[PDB]
Each structure stands twice: as C-alpha cells, then as structure tokens.
Design a binder for this molecule. Structure first.
Ligand SMILES: *[C@@H]1O[C@H](CO)[C@@H](O[C@@H]2O[C@H](CO)[C@@H](O[C@@H]3O[C@H](CO)[C@@H](O)[C@H](O)[C@@H]3O)[C@H](O)[C@H]2NC(C)=O)[C@H](O)[C@H]1NC(C)=O
Ligand SMILES: *[C@@H]1O[C@H](CO)[C@@H](O[C@@H]2O[C@H](CO)[C@@H](O[C@@H]3O[C@H](CO)[C@@H](O)[C@H](O)[C@@H]3O)[C@H](O)[C@H]2NC(C)=O)[C@H](O)[C@H]1NC(C)=O
Ligand SMILES: *[C@@H]1O[C@H](CO)[C@@H](O[C@@H]2O[C@H](CO)[C@@H](O)[C@H](O)[C@H]2NC(C)=O)[C@H](O)[C@H]1NC(C)=O
Ligand SMILES: *[C@@H]1O[C@H](CO)[C@@H](O[C@@H]2O[C@H](CO)[C@@H](O)[C@H](O)[C@H]2NC(C)=O)[C@H](O)[C@H]1NC(C)=O
Ligand code: NAG
Ligand code: NAG
Ligand code: NAG
Lengths: 585, 585, 118
C-alpha cells in the first residue's frame, strides 16, 4: 500500500488546492477562499460553495499545516486558510432564502454562488451542521495563532465570525433541518454530534481571549442529552423527528464519530468515540448492509473489507459506493486502533460481541491488556481489515488519480461529479490516521456527563456583521463562463401571481415567456414586498437587456412597462454583482 | 505515635457514640439519631443538636462502617446511622425561626432541641451549609445500600429527604447566611465548597435511582464559578459579601478543602484540592498567623508544627487553640501526601514556593517524580511536619482521653465545652488519612470546568414532608433534667408590645414579671398572628401552671384573663411536647 | 474620578464623627446600643449609651450602626456593645473592651466594622 498512499496523497492535496478560489486552477471567477465542491458544471452542477464541504476541507488543511510526509508549501497553505477565513466573514452577512444575519437564520444556508451571491432556487434548507463545522475549523487555526504570538489577530478578525456561529448553534440546535445528504428533514446524528463539539471548543477559546460565550456555558450538556436518543440498542439510527422511513443505517452515523474523534478520550459511549462499543457495533451493521446489494461486493465475506455507500436504500445516480464512505469506514477503525494503543487495553462487551467475533470466532467478553494473546490477535486483524478498505480504493482509483463522488455498484467505473473536494480530503484524513497522525484534542473527557433528565432551553443569540478581514495578495483565476448575478425586485402581488425575468440571452430564455427565470418569494414580507433571482450561466463581460413579468393565475403574461433594463456582466474577479430594481409602471 | 493513635482512636469512637441519642449514655431525653454537640449544659450550654456537627459526624461513622483497626460493632453502627436518617426525616418538617418546609427556608436552621422541637431564641441564622452536609452524609450511606441489594430502601425512605436538601441548595446557594462559627453574615468558602460537592453527588444518585434533580443539572458550574472569588492571590479569604473586617485568614478555608477532598482528583486549583498550589499556600498563611500570639507556640519555628485556632482575631473564651483545628491542619497534609503518591509526582510553582521552602530552602520551581531526590526529601519532611500536629495533641490530651472544644493559649488546659462530638470525629478522620484510608470519590475530576462568565440563576424548589422512616428497636436514655416544651400562641398586637409567659417553676420565673420567658415574633404574619417560646430547663414529670402577658411599650404588664393553664412535662422519650394556645380574654 | 486640588482642611478640634457598624442577629423588641469611657458614649452608664439604628437591617445582612459625633480629635477610648432586652435587662457582649483612637487633622470616614463578641 505504501507507494500508492504517497502518490495518491500528493494528488489529493493537489486536488484540494485546485478547487480553492484564489489560485486554484479549476475555479475561474471564484472568490479567494471559497472551495468549490467539484469543477462539474453539468450533470450534475456542483459549481457552488457549500458551508459543510468547505469547513471539513479547511479542517483537513489546517491539521496538515500544523502536523503530518510529502512536499508541502506551508506559506501557500497558510494564505489559503487566511483567505478561507476572510471569505466566510463576507458570506455571514449575505441574506438568502434561509433568512438574514440579523436574527441568525441566514447562517443555516447550505450553499452559495462562487462570487459571494446567494443561491435563489429551492433546496434542502436549512442545514444546521454548517456553522458548527466552520467554528470548529476556525477555532483550530485560532489556537495555532495564539501559540505563535498572534492573539490580537484572533480577537480582531476571527472572534467576530466564530461568535456568530456559536450563537447560532446555542439558539437553533433543538430545531429540525436537512441532513448532510440534503434529503431528510428532521434531526441528524452527525449534526447534533458536531454541534455538541463546536460549543465545547468555543468555551475554551472564549476563556483564552477573556470573552463570554453564554451558549457555550449553558447548552452542551442538553445537546449531549439529546444525542443519546440516536442509539437504538443495536446501531445508531441516523435521523429521528421525521416522517421519513428508511432503516436509519447510514454513513451519517460513522461520520459523526469520525469528526468528533478525540485522541485523548476513553472508549466513551456517551460521546460515541470510535473505540466505544456503540460505534463498533454500528460499524458492523453499516458495512454489512452493502455486502449483498452491490455486484462488486460478490464473495466479500464477514471479516473482509467491502465497498460501501451512503445508505442501503439510496437511488441517487443509481445508488452506489462513495469514495468518502469506503475511506470513512477505514478511518473509524484507525481511530479505534490509536485509542486502544494509548489506553493499553481493549474491552469486549455484549454490545460489541458481534463486531469482535468477525476477527476471532472464539472471543469472550472481558478486558484485554496490550501483552495478552487476544489483544495482539484482534488488533493485528482489525488493522488488516482497515487496510482492506484502502486496497479497494486502490483497485478503483483511475491512473490520473482523480477521485470522483461515486464509483459504480456494477462496474466500479467512476461517476457523478469529478474531483470532489471532500473525496480528496477524505483520502488525506484516513491515511493520516493509519500513520497515527491525530488532530488536537477537543476535550471530550470533560464533556461526557449526561444530565439526570433531558429538558431543552436554547438561548436567543446576538449577531453582528463581521467587518475585519486578513490582508492577502490573492486575487482570483479570471471569470469565464459563469458569473452569477442577483436581481432584487420590489413588487406587490396577490395570491397566485408569480414573478419571472426575461431577456436577450440564453440564461434568460431569449424573450420566450415559457423560458424566463423565476424569482423566489422566500424573503417577501408585509414589511418588504421583495422577490429575487440569482442567474448563473452568464459569461464574463456579457451585455444584456432584461424585463420583469408576472404569470397571472389565469395563465396571462403581464409585462412591466417602460424601457428594457440593461446590464453588463463584469470581468476578472466579481464581488456580488447585482441590481436593486423597482417594478416599472 | 502508634499506641496513642490506637488508644485515643478507640476513645474517640466511644466519645461519638456516648453523644448519639438512642443508646448514648450522655444523652438523657434525646431522641434516637440526634447527636448532641457536647454534654455541657452550662457555661457554655451545647445540649442541642446542630445540623452541621451531626452531618459531619454521620459522615465519619459511615466511612468507618464501610472502611478502616480497633474493635468495632458494625450492627450497632448501622443502627445508629439508620436512626440518624430517621431523626432527620422528622426535623425537616419542623417550623422554626428560619421558616417553614413549605418554601424550603426552615431547612437552613442551625440547631434544634433534643426532643425534636424548634429552638426559639435569637441566633446566627440561617446557616446554609447544613442541608449540603446532610445530603452528602446521606448519599454516602445510600450508595452503600444500593451496593448490598437494598435499593428499594434508598428510594422509599432516603430519596424524599435528600431531594428536599438538594432543592434547598439549588434555590438558596446565592444568598448570604452565617458562617460555621455562627458569627459572620455573608458568603463563606466552606459553605459554597460543600454546596458545590453535594449537588454533584446528588446527580450521580439521581441517575442510579431513575429520578430527576434539576438543581443538580443546572447549578454546579455557577457555584464553582462563584467559589473562584475566594482566592485573593496569596491565600483564601474565608468570608466575602460582608461588612465584617477581619483578615479572612481562618480555619474555615482549610475545612472547605478537607471536606471536599477527592482521592481520585489531581492537584486542581479550581476545586481547591489539598495538594493544589492554592490550598498549600493558604496552609502556610493559616498556620503562621498563630505562631506569635499563643504563648504555648513560643520557639516553634517555620517547618515545625504549631497549635492553631479558628482565626487570629478570635476572642471566644479567650481566643484559643481548638483540637479540631490542630487536627485539621494535619489532615490537609495527609490528603496532599496520598494524592502525590497516587499521581507519581508533585509540582512546585510560584504560588506554592513559600510553602515548600519551609522544608527545603534550596527548592526550585519544577516537576518532581517519585524517584527524584527532591520528591523524597519534600514528602518525608512534610510527613514529619503533619505528625508534629498529632504530637502536640498528644502533649495536651488528658489521661481520660476527653477532647474538649478548646485548650488554653497560655497553659494548654482544656476548656469551653467538654467531649465535643466534632473534636472526636476530627481525631478519627485525621488519623485515618495518616494511615491512607480515604472516603469514596465524589467526582471532582468531572466538576472542575469553570464557566466563561459568572451569572447566577438559582432554581425555586418543590418541597414535600418526608413520611417513611427506617424500622429500629432503639428507644432513648430516659429524660431527666431537660425536657424542652414549645408553646404556640395566637395573639394580635400593635408595634412595641412584646409577649412573654410566666409560671410557678424556676424556668418560667416563679411569677416574677421581670423573669418571664420571651416569645419570638419570627413567624408572626398578617395571615397568622403567631408567637412562640421553647422553654428548656424543665425536669421530666414536672407539673406546672402558666399564664401569658404583654410588656406594653409604656412598661405596664398586661396579663391574659381567665384561669392559669396547667401542663405536665412528659417522662421517658418525649417527642415534640407542646401546647397550641389562644389568648384568654 | 475627582478633580486635582491643593486644598486640605482646617484641622479637626472638638467634632470628629465616627461610624460603628455591627453584625448582630436579634429578635423583635431587642435594641442595640454602644457604651464606653468618654462623655459621648455615657461613661459606662447603660441609661446614657448611644443607640444604633436598624434602618439597614435585613435578612441578608443583620446590620446595626451608630455615628457618634461629639468626640474630640485624638481621643483614645474603650467601648462595648449591649442590648436592652424587651424586659428591661441589659445584656453586654462578652470578651475584652474594644479600643479606638479618634484621628487628627483631616479625617476621612473614620469607622469600625465589628462583629458581636460571644
Ligand atoms: C429538542 O430536545 C428535546 C429534549 O432532548 C427532544 O425531545 C426528546 O425527543 C426524543 C426523540 O424523539 C424523545 O424520545 C422518544 O420518547 C418516546 C416516548 O417515551 C420513545 O417511545 C422513543 O423511542 C424515544 O425515546 C424524548 O422523549 C424527547 N424528550 C423530551 C420531550 O423531553 C426533541 O426531540 C428535540 N427536538 C429537536 C428538533 O431537536
Ligand atoms: C451570587 O452570585 C454572583 C455571581 O457569581 C456573585 O457576584 C460576584 O461577586 C463577586 C464577589 O463579590 C464579585 O467579584 C468582585 O468584583 C469586584 C468588581 O469588579 C472586584 O473589585 C472584587 O475584588 C471582586 O472580584 C463579582 O464581580 C460578582 N459577579 C457578578 C455580579 O457577576 C454574588 O456575590 C453571589 N452572591 C451571593 C450572596 O452568593
Ligand atoms: C482523469 O480520469 C477520469 C476518469 O477516468 C476522467 O473523467 C472522465 O472523462 C471522460 C472523458 O470523456 C468522461 O466521459 C467521464 O464522464 C469522466 N468521468 C467523470 C467521473 O467525470 C478525466 O477526464 C481524466 N482527467 C484528465 C485531466 O484527463
Ligand atoms: C476527664 O478529664 C477532664 C479534663 O481534665 C475533666 O473535665 C474537667 O473536670 C473538672 C472537674 O472539676 C472541671 O473543673 C473542668 O471544668 C472540666 N473541664 C472541662 C473542659 O469541662 C473531666 O471531668 C474528666 N472526666 C471524668 C469522667 O472524670
Ligand atoms: C443584448 O442587449 C445588449 C444591450 O442592449 C446588446 O448590446 C447585445 O448586443 C444584445 N445581445 C444579443 C442580441 O445577443
Ligand atoms: C405548680 O402547679 C402545679 C399544677 O397546679 C402543682 O401541682 C404544683 O405542685 C405547683 N408547683 C410548685 C408550687 O412548685
Ligand atoms: C479611656 O480608654 C483609653 C483606652 O484604653 C485610655 O487610654 C484613656 O485614658 C481612657 N480615658 C478616660 C478614662 O477618660
């Protein structure tokens, strides 16, 4: 495995930087510090920035920057991290279909346009994990800055951003939202778990800076209390509080543990540590659910690595293995191995008995120290099993090293979005854990006491527009075919009227009222009769004419009066191009 | 030292049992399970039961009962503990000058009569440490019962009592009250520290029983936050929130650490563990404050044990060494020694530097493992220093083994109350720690995280009269000279009128209006115009006549009309003898 | 903050008011006084002792206080607290007499924070 991990590891770091706005070669017109999810523009279109993908990848690069094996430009990496932080200052102020910064709701928006404008269309919103992952990425870089004498930089630029995200989590954790696959509307294990961690970490940074974080003081025990409801007795039910019906067997559960891994923590069931009996039992159930149903898993018995997906009921693009799933499966095992090595022992219990019997059919319930025959046999066997997952990825990685979103359940051909940022991140992170490189401890050993009774009392936050940003020389790879522009219109309507825009270019339908671009009413209110559209497929420099109309509920087309409006799409590095318009009578 | 610890240790266990109502030979007319503070009846009169003395002594006997060296009747000890628990069920319902059970306020009353009646006179009330110490004693016996299959006994008899005390602490911790010496009205280190511990322990028992304790969930971090205000930078200021002015150097601070000692905890400054730099620095300051001022400390230099008192400004009975102070001084050191031995190391820091320089003038700041030359030198020297305190007690213990409250600053003669229950308890507890016998861990390692900001939000409790009690064969040592009777009177008055009672026996003044017994107005209200008196020096069986009168604000004596009222003091084992009276017109 | 000035004061002579603050829990009808060995404190005559006010006595702080005014600058004195019980009895605090020395020159809020001696 060793040469392939070196080769694909260099390739994976390159794949991340290529997708980072500023200098990334595959990000034309993207603002500095914004990660694209993939350079795919069509079938599917992933040429946007997601708060989740971007925060998980930032965490990956920050850990890399302070600890790792192959050639690395530290200066280039720190500038990218700084540009990431600056870009997020700006996005926190953007009003969007989830809401505004004023009351916090805007912060739960899943994705944005590459030029810092909001996305207008319908989507699985809100996704409440986002602020939590971003605070965790940011606190991690902040603790590095404090260590190297730059504490004034942390309090001036970084604390204003982190305080908004911590406040969001303190206020909204006990509301439903969409899961990380953007499909199921309810309460998600992964989301609650990362929310719990983010607040605990906020507390620690707040004390280093001499600041308050009331949310960080009051909420963590009650978030932990709720997180216990996901354990069903046999595995982790991934979504609850929902009308949805699937089994709940889902990678979501494995990712929750992976991304709340604490190297200094014991095998704690309360916080679901990777070496905990709950996480191991869930691992077996998760993996086994794919053995039967993918043709490329034929003959791969219990005790052997298999190719795994999001959830067994999945039909998205056929319902296939995901590279980040197969890699995540290994990473949970590598985390477990590290913890047992640190502790000097492992425990086999009733809950974990089936997991361990896949490596030793003989095994009995008991405690086993580092010296013992069972400890050696189980750990050496679990190690080979974990490597087996990386071996399957090796069989199915193309010669050019590209990691797509998916590989095919029947043929293993790569498919869906190419060069998925999070796929590359997932490779580095799994292979780091195999080599015993682990991130800073988040303090799980002091955030594991479950209350006597669950009783939720979230706190309303105070939110303030960030103002300061880091100084950087980064500009952007010039814009080409995609320059998203946002059009804001004031127009009072009656129930059943819908507002559209038309114009003399392809993205506006070339004056065909059947092909006009719809405006959303998500921010229409008695206080501001507002409609808006974000039109994306407009090349840099395009001059165009446009005009608003309504589709009346009888089918009639009612055009605004007056002359056509004119606009010129910018060139180079566009920042929130838009027009504020009032209906022409 | 060894023979004296065996001899005085047997004597001390005997001294405790002698003072325990039920079978204790020095407790005539005292109800089963009530500890008297001392058999002294005059100069001073300590023939009452205090919630503090009784709870600290119960903790001592419970620890003894599950772990200790000399002859011990375990059956006799368990019955006494059971009788203690039952007696406290009854007392929680007694209305008194601090208030009623209905709103919790009654629970802060410092002392009661030996026959379960309230004490009527003015006193340093409330003392808010009481409920906390009783809950801690009780939870400790409860965890023993659960271990030996008697969990239904814990939930039926014990939880109702403990829930009232935990609720009291959750509601009233952020109010002022009198300190443990019954003098200073403010906020006391000892009181906050034991309040913090009691709630943490309640949480653990509540989960074992499947019960709620909302107070135990919400309050501990904010109690811990407030406890940080007692550290002044050099020592622990014993009382704050007060008009009082003393230095704040006081045994109170040492007792706070001793009685929140956790053998499984590290040298934590946040919870002031005995081996913490804060507790050691305070130890030196506390001890040094007495070296100059007591004549019996002449020539006892730094590095040698000295005789110590309550606080350096003390004038009570002359202001003298207390046996429990001298012993407490040693116990803090023995606790420190145990913790360093468990951890494998000790640390010398700037805060602790003066403490350690008394045993090694050379010592430098650093960390020192068990193997090192400094660790051996410091620990062997600290050990001899601690023993030096027990050696001074040996010089000043009488041949009959009696431990009074005090011994004289000039002559070392024993004085004030003889056979102080808490003095005997303090001997067992210090000598146990010397022999490395330690109590169950209370979980300080999971209750040491200080919030980002202090912001108090106590919760209003729900209080319910306990009903169930343990079955016992214990009765009492028959009543002799002291049978306290309570007289409750309904009588409406105008401002300046005071109610008294007179009668034909010595305790009622033999019909002399100058010598009548005053009734208190502490429970007089627009809703119940109530006055009451608890008259104590009435021998068993006494028949008497009595009559109420007022001293008018002009000096006139106004007698109630009608015939004299008649009463007969009971014999044997009196339970709350009293009369409910209405003014005779 | 205050303004900077060179002003001091005309030195004190016959009137140096001192405030005595005492913590002491009582029952209804008890009044606290102070006595001592100078004229303003009544020369140990319990009929002539100085009364303390209960205006700031509360369940939260059992506080009594007196401001005694006709005490010349520099006077050294002994004092002791007592209660007049509602039956007329005089109950003295125990322990030694407390000692104080009235300041000279320009006194700023001379006072004593005291706790009843048992
Ligand atoms: C907001 O927080 C509260 C309190 O943690 C959450 O309420 C709890 O939700 C869980 C899961 O639905 C409930 O558990 C269920 O209880 C039923 C009935 O006993 C049982 O049959 C199920 O198997 C499951 O255990 C739990 O009772 C409930 N606790 C309460 C109300 O105190 C709530 O779900 C959270 N909501 C969101 C949107 O975050
Ligand atoms: C009830 O709980 C609150 C909150 O813990 C307590 O308030 C805090 O009291 C302390 C001690 O008096 C205050 O500290 C002091 O602050 C001043 C001014 O900055 C400083 O000069 C002193 O040396 C000392 O540090 C602290 O500020 C205060 N915190 C608040 C109000 O948030 C309160 O004392 C508790 N009361 C009782 C009766 O338990
Ligand atoms: C690297 O290899 C990948 C996978 O083989 C290539 O991606 C495919 O490119 C072909 C070209 O016609 C398309 O038909 C497929 O749809 C692509 N797959 C996916 C998942 O998008 C990729 O083109 C190669 N990269 C370079 C730079 O040559
Ligand atoms: C045990 O010894 C103590 C102390 O010497 C005795 O207590 C003293 O008794 C004398 C007897 O007249 C009194 O003057 C003292 O006031 C007592 N001291 C105190 C502190 O109370 C005690 O009497 C002896 N006990 C027995 C049972 O003989
Ligand atoms: C669309 O309108 C713009 C602005 O009037 C004009 O310059 C441009 O040539 C037009 N483009 C077409 C017809 O494609
Ligand atoms: C006091 O009164 C009682 C009841 O009338 C009477 O029996 C008793 O002898 C009297 N005691 C005296 C005068 O000591
Ligand atoms: C009063 O007491 C003080 C202090 O003890 C003493 O110095 C002074 O002489 C006394 N004054 C009298 C008796 O006038």
């Amino acid at each position: 495995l060793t040469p392939f991990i070196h080769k694909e590891g260099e390739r994976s770091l390159q794949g991340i930087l290529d997708n980072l706005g500023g200098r990334g070669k595959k990000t034309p017109g993207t603002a500095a510090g914004l990660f694209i999810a993939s350079p795919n523009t069509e079938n599917p279109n992933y040429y946007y920035t997601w708060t989740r993908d971007s925060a998980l990848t930032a965490k990956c690069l920050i850990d890399l920057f302070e600890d790792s094996v192959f050639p690395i430009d530290r200066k280039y990496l720190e500038t990218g991290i700084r540009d990431y932080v600056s870009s997020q200052a700006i996005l926190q102020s953007v009003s969007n279909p989830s809401g505004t910064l004023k009351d916090g709701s805007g912060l739960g928006e899943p994705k944005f346009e590459i030029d810092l404008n909001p996305f207008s269309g319908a989507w699985g919103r809100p996704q409440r994990d986002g602020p939590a992952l971003r605070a965790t990425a940011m606190i991690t870089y902040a603790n590095y800055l404090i260590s190297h004498g730059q504490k004034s930089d942390v309090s001036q630029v970084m604390w204003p951003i982190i305080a908004n995200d911590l406040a969001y989590v303190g206020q909204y954790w006990n509301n439903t939202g969409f899961d990380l696959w953007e499909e199921v509307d309810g309460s998600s294990f992964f989301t609650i778990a990362v929310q719990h961690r983010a607040l605990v970490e906020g507390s620690q940074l707040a004390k280093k800076l001499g600041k308050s974080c009331d949310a960080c003081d009051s909420q963590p025990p009650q978030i932990l209390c709720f997180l216990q409801s996901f354990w069903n007795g046999k595995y982790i039910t991934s979504n609850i509080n929902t009308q949805a019906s699937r089994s709940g067997i889902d990678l979501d559960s494995v990712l929750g543990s992976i991304h709340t891994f604490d190297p200094e923590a014991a095998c704690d069931d309360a916080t679901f540590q990777p070496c905990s009996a709950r996480a191991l039992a869930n691992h077996k159930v998760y993996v086994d659910s794919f053995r039967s149903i993918y043709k490329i898993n034929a003959g791969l018995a219990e005790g052997s690595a298999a190719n795994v997906g999001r959830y067994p009921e999945d039909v998205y693009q056929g319902g296939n293995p995901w590279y980040l799933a197969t890699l995540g499966a290994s990473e949970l095992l590598y985390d477990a191995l590290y913890q047992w090595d640190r502790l000097g022992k492992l425990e086999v219990s009733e809950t974990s008995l089936s997991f361990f019997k896949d490596f030793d059919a003989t095994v009995k319930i008991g405690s086993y120290s580092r010296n013992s025959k069972t400890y050696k046999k189980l750990t050496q066997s679990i190690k080979s099993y974990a490597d087996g997952f990386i071996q399957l990825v090796q069989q199915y990685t193309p010669s050019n090293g590209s990691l797509a979103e998916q590989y095919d359940r029947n043929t293993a051909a790569p498919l869906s979005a190419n060069d998925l940022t999070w796929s590359f991140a997932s490779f580095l992170t799994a292979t780091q854990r195999r080599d015993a490189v682990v991130p800073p401890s988040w303090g799980a050993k002091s955030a594991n006491k479950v209350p006597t009774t669950c009783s939720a009392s979230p706190v309303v936050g105070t939110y303030k527009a960030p103002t300061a940003t880091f100084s950087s020389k980064t500009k952007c790879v010039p814009a080409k075919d995609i320059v998203p522009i946002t059009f804001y219109l004031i127009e009072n309507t009656y129930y059943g009227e819908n507002v559209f825009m038309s114009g003399n270019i392809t993205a506006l339908g070339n004056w065909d009222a059947k092909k006009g671009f719809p405006l959303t009413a998500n921010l229409y209110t008695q206080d501001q009769n507002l409609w808006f559209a974000s039109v994306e497929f407009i090349p840099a420099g395009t001059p165009f004419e446009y005009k608003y109309y309504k589709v009346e509920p009888n089918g009639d087309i009612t055009w605004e009066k007056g002359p056509n409006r004119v606009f010129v799409a910018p060139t180079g590095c566009p920042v929130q191009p838009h027009s504020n318009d009032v209906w022409q009578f």
